Amino acid sequence: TTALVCDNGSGLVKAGFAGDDAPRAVFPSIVGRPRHQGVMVGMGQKDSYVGDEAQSKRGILTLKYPIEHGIITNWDDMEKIWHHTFYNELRVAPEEHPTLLTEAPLNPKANREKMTQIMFETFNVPAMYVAIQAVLSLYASGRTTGIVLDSGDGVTHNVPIYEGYALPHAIMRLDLAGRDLTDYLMKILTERGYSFVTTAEREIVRDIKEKLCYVALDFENEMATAASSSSLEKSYELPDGQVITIGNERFRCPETLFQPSFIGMESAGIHETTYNSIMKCDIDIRKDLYANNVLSGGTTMYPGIADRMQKEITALAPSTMKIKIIAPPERKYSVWIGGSILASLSTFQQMWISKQEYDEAGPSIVHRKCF
Amino acid sequence: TTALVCDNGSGLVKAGFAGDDAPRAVFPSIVGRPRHQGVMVGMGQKDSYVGDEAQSKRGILTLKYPIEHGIITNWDDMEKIWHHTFYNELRVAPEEHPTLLTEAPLNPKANREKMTQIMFETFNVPAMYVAIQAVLSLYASGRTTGIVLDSGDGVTHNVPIYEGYALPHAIMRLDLAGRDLTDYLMKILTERGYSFVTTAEREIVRDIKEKLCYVALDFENEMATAASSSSLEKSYELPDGQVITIGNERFRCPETLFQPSFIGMESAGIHETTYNSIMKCDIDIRKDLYANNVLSGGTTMYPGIADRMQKEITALAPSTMKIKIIAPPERKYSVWIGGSILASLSTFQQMWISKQEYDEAGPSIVHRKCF
Amino acid sequence: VPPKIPDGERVDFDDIHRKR
Ligand SMILES: Nc1ncnc2c1ncn2[C@@H]1O[C@H](COP(=O)(O)OP(=O)(O)O)[C@@H](O)[C@H]1O
Ligand SMILES: Nc1ncnc2c1ncn2[C@@H]1O[C@H](COP(=O)(O)OP(=O)(O)O)[C@@H](O)[C@H]1O
Ligand SMILES: [Mg+2]
Ligand SMILES: [Mg+2]
């Protein structure tokens, strides 16, 4: 039979059968209970709208993501999300399909063990396998080397790989991602008068960020230009009218990636953690990693980031090496495409964690040889 | 058995069995004791004529409404009105019929508790339920969202509802209604020479208001036109002859709704309290409320109000949103039609306040789960 | 606490046809 390539993610759940080009169903991972009282009788009001249904009734819900930073903080809601994904968005019972979840690097063990225990006890799948979210993104590019920066919505991690041999001592995981950029944008919009507070209006700020923000090639020059002319002010129409005008908030929101001091984080930007991740590698594979830097994940879709990052790394790196940044147009679904490719391989067909194996060793089987 | 859908209102009591299209008996809610001496013996003169009987003998009575502004100020008279409604206008003993009263939003608790105590002790009904007068008017329109402006004769209230979830923090109740318009019309008629003072002549002024007054599309242009030409002066024949001619009093009486400064009230008109009620709602359901503005109640029957209100809101609202005002022809009985629909539902059949429940918790049961 | 309406099945806006 065919395998189910699910990809929990944090912000958008992407799923679909193995062997295709794009995920079959992509929908936000939010579960929102209603918060008001409700007076109409017999309206058929449910107790929790999940997935894309709660992005249409969000006016009277309190949306809450079940995955904070890679890790899962609310297991009941995550179980509900998985149940919805299997039964309503794909309509395939899990009793007859292997599953291939994905997990960020350096995550707590208990999260992974609970994930496998749920998949084997509640949904009762035949066999499931958990894979690191960066190796898949490297599969999708058709490479076999390269250092991949997978800046998702929950957590940004940077896994270097050479000739198929991952370097476990050079993984640099940073917890700045799309959600913190949404919060920072929502916080700097208040400098013009627009106040978004409700958890429903966070979605509106996210839409503003997606449609308007861009990464500046040079930050100081843009700050000077936006403060003199008015060629940058782009307007946007809220879900009820009252258009708003975003000035130099456009390139200040995604600039947080390269200067995490804006949101008070100490660490260095995504332009310098990649160079540090490279320098921890051996001295003989640094040229190949320099030449095959891969971008993935949703947050790396800002217009103009593949040039800013290349300029920064070229500034840091030695002058002789060639710096090349692979930015495929299908960046958002790169991890899932790689997952489909990996699940479609014949050599991989014996790596699944078969159910009888789980019955013999318990949920701690995932840390064992079947990784 | 069938349920009794009574609707106390303030000015017209509307009642009838659940499941029909129109109330069975509609009659003014006035109780008038005779005031003169009376010399004929054996004429069979009663001590209080209630309902529609006191609108025919009003020449020698002192009519007094038992409901001032939604709240009930004279409980004995209200009990008399209910007794008349049950026994003479419907001729069904209340011992064998559930009742569904209606109550304005934000009313004093003691009023509701006394109402339920009367219904359970004096009339001894099997089970009664109290519902907010705006949710029913939303039922009758067949919608499930929308912001309903129910401008009755006692009090005008504006309850916004989305997807069946009422928003309790956005109810704007204003105490200007049909009665204040009657008093203001009676006060401005004195500018031509016609003086109505007696409580019986208030009914004549009410008839003048119903038959002649209309809401102007633009106030200043109408004031200028009525002051030059004479195409507006419509005449009306009093109950004894001596026709009167109403000039620019025609559109000045109902203009008080949009400028409550005429009768000295501070608040803003019904055109701006709706916009304020919308703006208190969340940012994502404002488009739906803009598109589904519902009118109800008697006082919204003035010829030309559904255009003036739309023009005003379109002036206030953002230019992109579409403003639509639902004005069904059956506006007056909209609340009662909705009440009939609600009482006819199967899902609602277990929400009644059963008598044994009242015996266990006292009259304060109404504020509890059985709302 | 505010009242909680038990969940039913259906319907609304489908009696407008049968009454109009
Ligand atoms: N076109 C875009 N432009 C800018 N940011 C985007 C765009 N699309 C998605 N994002 C950001 O990326 C996030 C989605 O990232 P995604 O790759 O789905 O995370 P995950 O790894 O959990 O699947 C969104 O929250 C959004 O903030
Ligand atoms: N055709 C009409 N034109 C103008 N005003 C009207 C008309 N019919 C009723 N009214 C006004 O509405 C009032 C009746 O309102 P109603 O909806 O019966 O109040 P309630 O909510 O108490 O039932 C009357 O007092 C009258 O002033
Ligand atoms: Mg991802
Ligand atoms: Mg009413």
XYZ file of N, CA and C in Angstrom, chain A residues 69-219:
453
model
N 7.132 25.559 20.300
C 8.414 25.660 19.604
C 8.844 24.242 19.274
N 8.347 23.706 18.173
C 8.713 22.349 17.842
C 8.066 21.356 18.780
N 8.299 21.518 20.080
C 7.718 20.628 21.072
C 6.207 20.807 21.109
N 5.527 19.796 21.625
C 4.072 19.791 21.702
C 3.690 19.990 23.158
N 2.901 21.023 23.427
C 2.585 21.402 24.793
C 1.198 20.966 25.239
N 0.340 20.533 24.322
C -1.053 20.231 24.645
C -1.443 18.982 23.870
N -1.294 17.820 24.504
C -1.378 16.569 23.754
C -2.793 16.266 23.291
N -3.804 16.644 24.063
C -5.167 16.383 23.626
C -5.485 17.124 22.329
N -5.104 18.398 22.245
C -5.353 19.158 21.029
C -4.580 18.592 19.851
N -3.345 18.147 20.077
C -2.581 17.566 18.984
C -3.227 16.281 18.497
N -3.751 15.480 19.417
C -4.471 14.277 19.020
C -5.694 14.636 18.188
N -6.403 15.689 18.592
C -7.553 16.133 17.814
C -7.141 16.561 16.411
N -6.019 17.277 16.304
C -5.551 17.721 14.998
C -5.213 16.525 14.118
N -4.522 15.538 14.681
C -4.182 14.358 13.897
C -5.427 13.618 13.451
N -6.405 13.478 14.342
C -7.635 12.787 13.984
C -8.336 13.492 12.839
N -8.411 14.819 12.909
C -8.992 15.574 11.803
C -8.217 15.339 10.520
N -6.882 15.407 10.598
C -6.070 15.271 9.395
C -6.316 13.931 8.726
N -6.342 12.860 9.513
C -6.536 11.546 8.920
C -7.942 11.386 8.363
N -8.963 11.748 9.132
C -10.303 11.324 8.741
C -11.014 12.292 7.804
N -10.789 13.600 7.913
C -11.584 14.540 7.135
C -10.824 15.182 5.989
N -9.513 15.375 6.120
C -8.768 16.012 5.044
C -8.195 15.003 4.055
N -7.992 13.761 4.484
C -7.535 12.699 3.600
C -8.531 11.565 3.459
N -9.381 11.354 4.463
C -10.429 10.338 4.420
C -9.864 8.942 4.196
N -8.740 8.636 4.834
C -8.164 7.302 4.786
C -7.962 6.814 6.210
N -8.555 5.690 6.526
C -8.369 5.170 7.871
C -6.903 4.824 8.097
N -6.349 5.143 9.265
C -4.928 4.891 9.510
C -4.594 3.431 9.746
N -5.587 2.545 9.797
C -5.296 1.144 10.077
C -4.583 0.472 8.918
N -4.511 1.127 7.766
C -3.996 0.503 6.557
C -2.957 1.377 5.885
N -2.203 2.148 6.659
C -1.237 3.033 6.026
C -0.071 3.366 6.952
N 1.165 3.171 6.503
C 2.305 3.630 7.286
C 2.375 5.145 7.301
N 2.969 5.685 8.356
C 3.048 7.128 8.547
C 4.502 7.530 8.736
N 4.849 8.731 8.295
C 6.205 9.252 8.392
C 6.151 10.655 8.972
N 6.170 10.765 10.301
C 6.149 12.074 10.928
C 7.497 12.757 10.769
N 7.539 14.042 11.110
C 8.788 14.799 11.081
C 8.946 15.554 12.389
N 10.193 15.737 12.812
C 10.508 16.303 14.110
C 11.738 17.187 13.994
N 11.731 18.302 14.707
C 12.875 19.190 14.692
C 14.057 18.543 15.409
N 15.277 18.968 15.104
C 16.438 18.438 15.826
C 16.470 18.927 17.262
N 17.132 18.157 18.114
C 17.387 18.538 19.504
C 16.105 18.753 20.294
N 15.057 18.009 19.987
C 13.817 18.128 20.731
C 13.795 17.168 21.913
N 12.969 17.444 22.917
C 12.887 16.543 24.068
C 12.485 15.144 23.649
N 13.037 14.157 24.348
C 12.717 12.773 24.023
C 11.247 12.478 24.269
N 10.719 12.923 25.405
C 9.357 12.573 25.781
C 8.368 12.950 24.694
N 8.622 14.043 23.985
C 7.744 14.438 22.896
C 7.695 13.354 21.822
N 8.858 12.891 21.385
C 8.915 11.867 20.353
C 8.309 10.547 20.814
N 8.603 10.139 22.048
C 8.047 8.889 22.552
C 6.530 8.958 22.663
N 5.994 10.068 23.167
C 4.551 10.221 23.235
C 3.938 10.226 21.845
N 4.619 10.833 20.876
C 4.106 10.836 19.515
C 3.974 9.422 18.981
N 5.006 8.603 19.169
C 4.926 7.235 18.655
C 3.907 6.418 19.427
N 3.781 6.652 20.735
C 2.800 5.914 21.515
C 1.390 6.244 21.061
N 1.112 7.515 20.798
C -0.198 7.891 20.278
C -0.443 7.213 18.940
N 0.513 7.328 18.017
C 0.297 6.772 16.686
C 0.074 5.267 16.740
N 0.663 4.581 17.716
C 0.497 3.133 17.750
C -0.707 2.689 18.562
N -1.147 3.476 19.537
C -2.243 3.019 20.383
C -3.581 3.599 19.939
N -3.653 4.911 19.759
C -4.939 5.509 19.411
C -5.291 5.250 17.956
N -4.467 5.733 17.033
C -4.773 5.567 15.618
C -4.436 4.182 15.099
N -3.528 3.466 15.760
C -3.266 2.054 15.476
C -2.752 1.848 14.053
N -1.720 2.603 13.693
C -1.119 2.521 12.366
C -0.342 1.215 12.237
N -0.034 0.755 11.025
C 0.813 -0.437 10.910
C 2.264 -0.182 11.283
N 2.832 0.955 10.885
C 4.228 1.249 11.178
C 4.487 2.726 10.937
N 5.243 3.363 11.825
C 5.542 4.780 11.721
C 7.028 5.026 11.904
N 7.526 6.083 11.272
C 8.935 6.440 11.338
C 9.066 7.945 11.470
N 10.000 8.381 12.309
C 10.202 9.795 12.609
C 11.524 10.233 12.001
N 11.497 11.322 11.247
C 12.674 11.795 10.537
C 12.936 13.258 10.860
N 14.207 13.642 10.816
C 14.629 14.998 11.133
C 14.258 15.913 9.981
N 13.705 17.079 10.300
C 13.093 17.926 9.283
C 14.089 18.492 8.289
N 15.390 18.402 8.552
C 16.343 19.013 7.637
C 16.851 18.031 6.590
N 16.994 16.761 6.957
C 17.437 15.764 5.989
C 16.449 15.667 4.839
N 15.157 15.772 5.130
C 14.173 15.745 4.059
C 14.342 16.931 3.126
N 14.526 18.126 3.686
C 14.713 19.295 2.844
C 15.961 19.162 2.003
N 16.936 18.391 2.476
C 18.095 18.116 1.636
C 17.784 17.088 0.562
N 16.907 16.128 0.856
C 16.444 15.201 -0.173
C 15.794 15.949 -1.320
N 14.887 16.869 -0.999
C 14.099 17.525 -2.029
C 14.958 18.310 -3.006
N 16.089 18.845 -2.559
C 16.966 19.578 -3.455
C 17.746 18.667 -4.387
N 17.672 17.356 -4.188
C 18.396 16.442 -5.037
C 19.887 16.436 -4.804
N 20.338 17.033 -3.709
C 21.747 17.035 -3.358
C 22.059 15.814 -2.518
N 23.314 15.735 -2.091
C 23.719 14.812 -1.050
C 24.656 15.444 -0.039
N 25.059 16.692 -0.247
C 25.830 17.452 0.724
C 25.116 18.759 1.005
N 25.766 19.670 1.702
C 25.156 20.965 1.888
C 24.676 21.174 3.308
N 24.579 22.439 3.688
C 24.123 22.828 5.018
C 22.794 23.543 4.872
N 21.751 22.989 5.473
C 20.384 23.425 5.216
C 19.895 24.238 6.401
N 19.368 25.422 6.119
C 18.811 26.319 7.131
C 17.297 26.283 6.999
N 16.633 25.567 7.900
C 15.199 25.308 7.784
C 14.442 26.205 8.757
N 14.217 27.438 8.340
C 13.596 28.434 9.213
C 12.085 28.299 9.138
N 11.534 27.425 9.952
C 10.102 27.199 9.957
C 9.347 28.336 10.619
N 8.198 27.985 11.191
C 7.414 28.946 11.952
C 7.606 28.774 13.448
N 8.011 27.595 13.887
C 8.266 27.400 15.295
C 9.711 27.642 15.665
N 10.635 26.983 14.968
C 12.034 26.969 15.362
C 12.903 26.912 14.117
N 14.021 27.627 14.151
C 14.984 27.664 13.062
C 16.193 26.821 13.435
N 16.488 25.804 12.631
C 17.602 24.907 12.898
C 18.429 24.757 11.636
N 19.702 24.441 11.812
C 20.710 24.549 10.763
C 21.592 23.305 10.807
N 21.236 22.299 10.019
C 21.876 20.987 10.076
C 22.851 20.867 8.912
N 24.158 20.753 9.157
C 25.093 20.503 8.062
C 25.264 19.022 7.798
N 25.354 18.679 6.520
C 25.468 17.296 6.078
C 26.526 17.231 4.992
N 27.356 16.195 5.025
C 28.341 15.979 3.982
C 28.288 14.530 3.540
N 28.221 14.317 2.230
C 28.259 12.992 1.615
C 27.300 12.013 2.264
N 26.212 12.509 2.839
C 25.273 11.659 3.530
C 25.583 11.415 4.985
N 26.721 11.884 5.482
C 27.093 11.698 6.877
C 26.790 12.979 7.636
N 25.723 12.963 8.425
C 25.367 14.129 9.218
C 26.400 14.364 10.307
N 26.601 15.629 10.651
C 27.571 16.016 11.665
C 26.826 16.407 12.933
N 26.629 15.492 13.880
C 25.767 15.804 15.027
C 26.308 16.885 15.930
N 27.602 17.186 15.869
C 28.149 18.189 16.765
C 28.062 19.598 16.204
N 27.504 19.776 15.014
C 27.443 21.077 14.372
C 26.026 21.549 14.108
N 25.042 21.012 14.812
C 23.669 21.460 14.650
C 23.426 22.654 15.561
N 23.022 23.772 14.980
C 22.772 24.994 15.727
C 21.291 25.321 15.652
N 20.568 25.035 16.726
C 19.125 25.248 16.772
C 18.831 26.547 17.496
N 18.090 27.429 16.840
C 17.727 28.730 17.378
C 16.212 28.850 17.385
N 15.653 29.407 18.448
C 14.209 29.391 18.626
C 13.513 30.632 18.091
N 14.188 31.466 17.314
C 13.517 32.562 16.628
C 12.953 32.050 15.313
N 11.694 32.364 15.041
C 11.051 31.855 13.841
C 9.896 32.773 13.485
N 9.009 32.290 12.617
C 7.946 33.132 12.100
C 7.014 33.668 13.169
N 6.746 32.881 14.209
C 5.818 33.333 15.234
C 6.363 34.541 15.982
N 7.651 34.525 16.320
C 8.222 35.682 16.983
C 8.227 36.893 16.066
N 8.399 36.685 14.762
C 8.308 37.813 13.847
C 6.891 38.360 13.797
N 5.885 37.493 13.867
C 4.510 37.981 13.918
C 4.279 38.804 15.167
N 4.757 38.322 16.313
C 4.567 39.075 17.544
C 5.302 40.404 17.502
N 6.517 40.417 16.964
C 7.245 41.677 16.884
C 6.583 42.642 15.918
N 6.054 42.153 14.802
C 5.337 43.043 13.900
C 4.108 43.608 14.580
N 3.369 42.763 15.299
C 2.193 43.229 16.022
C 2.584 44.240 17.086
N 3.819 44.166 17.568
C 4.248 45.091 18.610
C 4.724 46.418 18.031
N 5.317 46.400 16.838
C 5.751 47.656 16.230
C 4.663 48.336 15.431
N 3.583 47.635 15.090
C 2.474 48.328 14.455
C 1.840 49.340 15.387
N 2.029 49.181 16.698
C 1.393 50.089 17.635
C 1.989 51.482 17.572
N 3.102 51.646 16.868
C 3.742 52.945 16.739
C 3.023 53.852 15.759
N 2.043 53.337 15.039
C 1.259 54.187 14.163
C -0.173 54.350 14.641
N -0.625 53.496 15.547
C -1.946 53.648 16.116
C -2.777 52.388 16.043
N -2.355 51.427 15.234
C -3.105 50.196 15.034
C -2.772 49.231 16.156
N -3.777 48.857 16.938
C -3.585 47.933 18.044
C -4.297 46.626 17.753
N -3.527 45.545 17.658
C -4.077 44.199 17.531
C -3.721 43.444 18.800
N -4.728 42.924 19.497
C -4.541 42.269 20.781
C -5.108 40.858 20.779
N -6.328 40.695 20.275
C -7.004 39.411 20.351
C -6.209 38.346 19.621
N -6.319 37.109 20.100
C -5.664 35.997 19.427
C -6.190 35.772 18.024
N -7.364 36.307 17.696
C -7.854 36.232 16.329
C -7.143 37.243 15.440
N -6.815 38.415 15.979
C -6.151 39.441 15.190
C -4.688 39.136 14.933
N -4.110 38.185 15.663
C -2.782 37.706 15.318
C -2.764 37.130 13.914
N -3.865 36.514 13.486
C -3.943 36.021 12.116
C -3.911 37.166 11.120
N -4.582 38.270 11.428
C -4.540 39.417 10.525
C -3.130 39.977 10.441
N -2.440 40.067 11.579
C -1.065 40.546 11.522
C -0.190 39.583 10.749
N -0.452 38.282 10.854
C 0.305 37.325 10.060
C 0.086 37.548 8.580
N -1.154 37.831 8.179
C -1.412 38.096 6.766
C -0.698 39.354 6.308
N -0.685 40.392 7.144
C 0.065 41.593 6.793
C 1.525 41.251 6.574
N 2.107 40.468 7.478
C 3.513 40.115 7.371
C 3.787 39.351 6.089
N 2.923 38.398 5.758
C 3.143 37.607 4.557
C 3.055 38.464 3.303
N 2.073 39.351 3.235
C 1.836 40.041 1.979
C 2.700 41.274 1.775
N 3.164 41.920 2.840
C 3.850 43.196 2.674
C 5.328 43.175 3.020
N 5.729 42.496 4.085
C 7.095 42.606 4.570
C 8.092 42.013 3.580
N 9.298 42.578 3.578
C 10.400 42.104 2.761
C 11.702 42.388 3.491
N 12.746 41.656 3.135
C 14.039 41.788 3.795
C 14.894 42.777 3.022
N 15.406 43.780 3.722
C 16.204 44.813 3.081
C 17.599 44.302 2.771
N 18.117 44.702 1.608
C 19.479 44.332 1.252
C 20.490 45.009 2.159
N 20.303 46.295 2.435
C 21.129 47.016 3.388
C 20.222 47.779 4.337
N 20.375 47.531 5.631
C 19.398 48.021 6.593
C 19.466 49.527 6.795
